[PDB]
């Protein structure tokens, strides 16, 4: 009985400690992710001891580079360093991969269309036309104004519950369906019109 009481007390103390240990590990997960990102940057990008700085080059959006580099330099200066980071541009004959900016609703359609590939930094983007073309064609194959209402209603609940849906996980097929709620709603509206 004494040994069981001691074991119970030790287990209770361990659980009480783990209650805060898990809370600390919650933020430690993001800390470890940031450390891993910095480690990948260090192992991938070299540095100059003569410059006593980490230097390199990489692709960046011109619009983003208009403010991101300045913000990084300002943060480096605010980090009590003797001098902030650089913001110089670089040029090369190679064509870096690039992605067009994705909106909150256009993201799903853009991802669906991009499953065939990508293009140059500012080349043709068939996603712009197909964002409405696919609803403009998939409606005909299912044109019946008694079921399109049902499809829209089913999509509508997903859009409404999006606040809770974004947090709670679901089935893999269910998650894939919820990923394109706006596209599903647009297709349902087109089908209702058809």
């Amino acid at each position: 009985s004494e040994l069981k009481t001691t074991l119970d007390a030790g287990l209770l103390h361990r659980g009480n400690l783990l209650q805060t240990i898990g809370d600390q590990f919650e933020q430690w997960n993001l800390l470890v992710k940031r450390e891993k990102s910095i480690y990948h940057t260090l192992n991938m990008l070299s540095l100059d001891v003569t410059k006593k700085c980490l230097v390199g080059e990489g692709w960046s959006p011109v619009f983003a580079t208009k403010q991101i580099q300045d913000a990084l330099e300002r943060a480096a200066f605010d980090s009590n360093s003797q001098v902030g980071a650089i913001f110089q541009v670089l040029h090369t004959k190679e064509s870096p991969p690039t992605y067009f900016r994705t909106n909150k609703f256009t993201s799903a359609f853009q991802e669906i269309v991009d499953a065939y590939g990508v293009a140059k930094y500012r080349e043709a983007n068939p996603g712009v036309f197909t964002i409405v073309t696919f609803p403009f064609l998939f409606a005909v194959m299912f044109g019946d104004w008694g079921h399109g209402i049902c499809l829209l209603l089913g999509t509508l609940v997903l859009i409404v519950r999006e606040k809770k849906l974004a947090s709670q996980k679901l089935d893999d097929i269910t998650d894939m369906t919820f990923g394109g709620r706006y596209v599903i709603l647009m297709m349902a509206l087109f089908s209702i019109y058809t």
């Binding site: 100059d48 003569t50 410059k51 110089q88």
Partner: protein
């Protein structure tokens, strides 16, 4: 840029080399000077 940054590094390396030589120079100079001073001090004992 890179060449401009390299000049500061070369100057720093030259200053480092000068500082490194300064140690031996000062050590030898002080040794000789204090040998003369110690000889004078020992001569004072004779007086």
């Amino acid at each position: 840029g890179i060449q401009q940054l390299l000049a500061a590094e070369q100057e720093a390396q030259h200053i480092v080399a000068a500082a490194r030589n300064a140690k031996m120079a000062r050590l030898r100079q002080a040794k000789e000077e204090a040998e003369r001073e110690i000889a004078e001090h020992r001569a004072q004992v004779e007086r």
